Design a protein around this ligand. Structure first.
Ligand SMILES: Nc1ncnc2c1ncn2[C@@H]1O[C@H](COP(=O)(O)OP(=O)(O)CP(=O)(O)O)[C@@H](O)[C@H]1O
Ligand SMILES: Nc1ncnc2c1ncn2[C@@H]1O[C@H](COP(=O)(O)OP(=O)(O)CP(=O)(O)O)[C@@H](O)[C@H]1O
Ligand SMILES: Nc1ncnc2c1ncn2[C@@H]1O[C@H](COP(=O)(O)OP(=O)(O)CP(=O)(O)O)[C@@H](O)[C@H]1O
Ligand SMILES: Cc1ncsc1CCO
Ligand SMILES: Cc1ncsc1CCO
Ligand SMILES: Cc1ncsc1CCO
Ligand SMILES: [Mg+2]
Ligand SMILES: [Mg+2]
Ligand SMILES: [Mg+2]
Lengths: 510, 511, 510
């Protein structure tokens, strides 16, 4: 026997016999990754060849102290004395299954939505002693969290969790990283690979690899210091962020809709850094390669979800993206298109206005502080919420993740959030590409940071310089038209003078 | 719950959802059908829709007092208080299953070979409390008996049986009828039907029609007297037989190899009947419709199994008689197949072969040929003829009788009527070609002549004399091979027109 | 250099790069069969990869003392100093080629017809120093000989010959065997394999194999003594042929047209041996396997050339066929169908009447003796020519063949030919299947022979017993109809009495 409690879901290898590399058995693979938990899925063979393959492997496994788990069948295992069974949502009811296998056998369940964890919990312990969460990629992380959360809300502590579907080395760290509860108390208990150890020409190696990622603790997703800063941003600091980004001249690639095209192009080389509006898929790897490049990502744009994914990755592969979802919560179509981009990579910063920043937090004023803080954490990013008060929460937690210990209780309630204001300036809401352009700005700051830089300040820097240059234009203008041209000026000037002690905006604490 | 001893396998409906007539449910069909025993096959669906589906039906059955059985899915079975579970030769080991389901519950097993009945028995009672015999048609009856036998050679008296695979109304009586143990003590306990109640646009009526056949007990496969005759054929009888076939002038169609083409052509119109040598398919249904038609069937011939099955079926659809001459049952791999295959296309009125061929058909000296003839003629429910120095003529039709699992009231392969027709050494008879093909043409002509009140046995025995008779004569009147043949045909031509069987050379003994 | 005269064409390996078994080079193959002459054919690559592959191999070869020969090119070789070149009929003119490569270089030519050897010879020596004869199988042997003959008729002694196209172990002996001149002086100088050594998984082995066959001397094609008998057949002998074939009961399979079907069936078991008319392809191997089986082959029959080839081979594979070509020289279609069967296997005996026996000899009375003798030799068989005098020539030469030394001068003029007569019996020409039935007879004799038997006498036996039983019937009959039935009798009787001292026919010498 095994005790439910000795079940280590670290790296959970689920098989699919029909996809084995030639000149290699299944026993041959499952052995390799055993030397670096295991379930069997055979939804096709003869339930006798099933029982033979299963016994042959149940013994390999017990030699390594690891248990064995079976699929759609509740006859087989029983008949071969297996350690547990894992059924999908359209397989057999969870009560019936316990009535046969009785207490003492690990029961896996596939959970995609939360109405399912509400069920899972309306059954108590000794039924569903774990679950494999939805199908991340073919819902992604965002959905993984709606679940990890219905767990806490239901205090379902007995049930563990393993992430399943789409997992690879080119995305594992990220799944493990942003797949933490909303309260930060519960993360994922493990990962399920398939086409990664099974279909591998050398499963000795690949299993080592996926181990390297799984029990590391450090997702450095961007080459900029992620340390949690509690102390407001200091004049000397904003000053050096600018001095950096000027000395640096970040190449900021703009994938964006058409209105912001010219505007943001200037707002960029006004900040004294070169811009590139390229929506060509073959370049994305050549650009992201350039010394200080930085990616501005706008939604709505005329570009296809293929090339957006190509870029989000092209940069992540080299370690800093700024993402502007506009609207991202207006129409059905925008809703999708964003959520889909949001599973492609890991973003350095998500900047949105009060509608967008509530939509992402999953639907006033204190509210907007609660909200930015969610979105900052949920997507492990510095989130920015543009308004009369720009709020700037930091949810990156230094790049830390763990298995099922979550984050040392660092909820979506207690992360560093701030406030940048200079009172009523309605006439910033009456220019186009205004928020899109706070993006180009935030973006230039982040790009100019060196390794030892700090990501939070570079954003909090950007939001000042902009709110600052925005108070000015608003004064020196006759309306909208001129407002824009005086804003681009106020930026071109504010920066070359580089004397932050001047700047309009007051920086509070949330 | 049911007691194993309460399962009536009569009509055993095994489902397959993915073939339901539109504007009809499964419940919908399985309800007309319970107006016995039901099994549920879902080798595709979701184990959960499965379970819901299994429950919807378990009630339906229990309402008509009939039980339900699952398939491969032993868990589903347990899970829903299923009455039995039926698994295949490559599904879960029987032991394992009994370990989980434990006694009280029925276990079906798909059997097809005898090696499998042996295993079945080396496990004894309370394990496999019934089997489903192979796939009859896509092996056949021949190989259903091979198992029915191993079952009796292993007194596995607990194990019930059901025939399955290809079972339709155009072949159910034949299957029930010739699927009996070699000792005539055990027959099939019931039938499995699938495509025929389910895909029916009127399951209500298809179930009735399958009842009709299944518990009836009379397969009148040929429109001739099948009574078990025990007294030797009498001269008055062989005389009337001839008088009948002369006066009715039977049509004898000849599917036969190329040498026997002209020979038996004459041997036929020399027996006062007309011969057709047609291997045309379009025709068969037209010919076998002629008032006295009869089919003589040789092998090796150039025609395709397609047309042969076309023809065998043709005549059987109309209860007209078939004569079968399997050339070299073991001659060569290829012929072996061909024949074992045709032997499952219909119900023969007579099988005729030499010693080798009749040892081939009995399934491998002198007393031996009597035993063997009795076997071949019982196995395939027919009057079978082994030719040699002595011709032996066993009757195996048991009067067209069949029953369910009561087999045949203990009438084995050993105590059917077998006789014998010798007239001394005539070596010169096998030294002419188509001699056995031509004994057929004769047997074919004599059965052709028979009317309803006729009698199939005596009619075979008639032709075997007439032949061996004209055999003796031709031999005495020749000077070689070539001359022998022309004296034979002539001997026949004369013998009959004078029809005085008081004269004839050949002595009719008992086996 | 190599001297034309040191060129040993034993086993001539011509390449086709594009058909090499994986994990095996071409160098890798050509080496193997070198350790057990060689030409290169590359009608596709770049004439530079050609020149590299060629040099790489020209050196492998010279290490084994073997020369190298090239294909359609007269530039390459020259450029790579090769030992010879082999051009087809649609390649470059043979004069032009000599004008470039000049004397001293072996020039191969592909010759299929004889108008080509007439050309080949209208050029003298030093041009075409060899030829590869037609394309045997995809014309066959029969055509190989029309050529080997236009050689002699032209006394072209300089030119050697190699057989090419279709050669394999399952037919090599036969090609080498019946491919002898008409005068017996010149046989084939060697064989060309391709898809046999090149495409082989183990070319070490296969090259050994094709060597075993090539420089052996003994084609035992039938399990019956082939010795050349000069002494007429003796009564005691005919007597024992019968005693044998009766004691034996040969299973004689009859593939034949429909008229002879019944007749010959009797004429068979009259000779007290069992007959089988089977035209089913799946049986041919089961029958030919039976203790004393023997094949009767009739033309015209309703059977397809596929199943005829299946049988001719099925028997040859087990070692005795009797072949009756009727007509075989009437219509265009018959003409083909026969010539085609005549390349499928090796026949123990070819029985034909005076039209058929002239047609085969390639178009009176002395003539018919000259003719049967040709056909007997040409197809390395005992040929029988039915007439008023049945002639019986023996052209098997004991199963001997050699490379290019032919047969020790044993022409188509000087083989054992005889004559069986019993004067005018017109009424044998007025029954059907008469010659077809001499076949069934000849056939039963041959079948009953044991290893130590002799094939010539068994035929010469058959032709008596038949001419004998034919004189009788002709006497004891009223016309045709009865003639047949008294003939079948005379055979049934003649044999069981077995007292040859009686028999009508006189056996002369041709
Ligand atoms: N009433 C106000 N008072 C002070 N600043 C304001 C303001 N309204 C807008 N802003 C400033 O302008 C920026 C963006 O404007 P907004 O809140 O409308 O986002 P948005 O996504 O709608 C821009 P777009 O026009 O490209 O869609 C902010 O970052 C903020 O600093
Ligand atoms: N030695 C013998 N003595 C007496 N009768 C014999 C005999 N051999 C054959 N016969 C007779 O000839 C008929 C068939 O004999 P047999 O069975 O040996 O031929 P067969 O089946 O090989 C015919 P085919 O040539 O079509 O294959 C019978 O009616 C039988 O009585
Ligand atoms: N004028 C004659 N005198 C003696 N024998 C003769 C004869 N004419 C035919 N025969 C005999 O009959 C045999 C075959 O007859 P034939 O020479 O016509 O060959 P064939 O191919 O024409 C026969 P088929 O009728 O089957 O086509 C010979 O082997 C020979 O012994
Ligand atoms: C900066 C930029 N990026 C893509 S196009 C473009 C405009 C060239 O002036
Ligand atoms: C008897 C026969 N059968 C088909 S055709 C035929 C020829 C007519 O004498
Ligand atoms: C001898 C023979 N061969 C194939 S059929 C046949 C006729 C069966 O009497
Ligand atoms: Mg915006
Ligand atoms: Mg027979
Ligand atoms: Mg002929």
């Amino acid at each position: 026997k095994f005790s439910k409690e000795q079940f280590d879901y670290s790296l959970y290898l689920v098989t699919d016999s029909g996809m084995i590399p030639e000149g290699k058995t299944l026993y041959g693979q499952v052995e390799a990754g055993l030397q670096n938990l295991v379930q069997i899925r055979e939804k096709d063979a003869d339930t006798k060849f099933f029982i033979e393959e299963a016994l042959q492997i149940k013994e390999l496994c017990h030699a390594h102290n690891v248990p064995l788990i079976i699929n759609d069948r509740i006859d087989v295992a029983m008949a071969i004395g297996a350690d547990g069974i894992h059924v999908g949502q359209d397989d057999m009811p969870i009560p019936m299954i316990r009535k046969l296998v009785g207490p003492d056998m690990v029961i896996g369940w596939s959970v995609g939505f939360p109405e399912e964890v509400d069920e899972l919990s309306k059954m108590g312990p000794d039924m569903v002693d774990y679950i494999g969460v939805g199908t991340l990629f073919p819902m992604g992380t965002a959905g993984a969290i709606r679940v990890l959360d219905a767990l806490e809300r239901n205090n379902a502590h007995w049930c563990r969790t393993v992430g399943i579907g789409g997992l690879h080395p080119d995305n594992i760290e990220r799944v493990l990283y942003q797949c933490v509860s909303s309260n930060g108390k519960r993360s994922l208990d493990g990962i399920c690979v398939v086409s990664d150890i099974i279909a591998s020409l050398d499963a000795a190696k690949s299993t080592k690899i996926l181990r390297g990622l799984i029990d590391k603790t450090d997702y450095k997703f961007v080459n900029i210091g992620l340390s949690t800063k509690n102390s407001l941003t200091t004049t000397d600091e904003i000053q050096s962020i600018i001095s950096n980004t000027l000395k640096a001249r970040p190449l900021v690639q703009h994938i964006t809709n058409k209105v912001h095209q010219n505007f943001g192009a200037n707002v960029t080389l006004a900040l004294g850094s070169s811009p590139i509006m390229s929506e060509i898929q073959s370049e994305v790897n050549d650009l992201a390669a350039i010394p200080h490049a930085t990616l501005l990502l706008n939604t709505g744009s005329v570009a296809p979800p293929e090339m957006l994914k190509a870029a989000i990755r092209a940069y992540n592969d080299v370690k800093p993206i700024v993402f502007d979802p506009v609207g991202y919560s207006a129409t059905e179509t925008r809703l999708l298109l964003n959520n889909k981009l949001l599973t492609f990579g890991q973003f350095s910063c998500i900047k949105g206005n009060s509608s967008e920043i509530l939509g992402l937090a999953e639907l006033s004023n204190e509210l907007l502080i609660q909200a930015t803080k969610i979105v900052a954490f949920k997507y492990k990013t510095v989130a920015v919420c543009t308004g009369e008060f720009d709020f700037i929460a930091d949810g990156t937690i230094e790049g830390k993740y763990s298995l099922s210990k979550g984050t040392n209780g660092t909820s979506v309630e207690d992360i560093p959030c701030v406030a940048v204001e200079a009172g009523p300036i309605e006439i910033m809401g009456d220019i186009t590409a205004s928020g899109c352009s706070l993006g180009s700005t935030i973006a230039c700051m982040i790009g100019g940071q060196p390794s030892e830089g700090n990501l939070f300040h570079a954003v909090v820097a950007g939001v000042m310089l902009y709110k600052a240059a925005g108070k000015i234009a608003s004064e020196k203008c006759n309306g909208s038209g001129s407002f824009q041209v005086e804003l681009i000026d106020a930026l071109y000037r504010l920066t070359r003078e580089n004397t932050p002690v001047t700047w309009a905006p007051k920086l509070t604490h949330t």
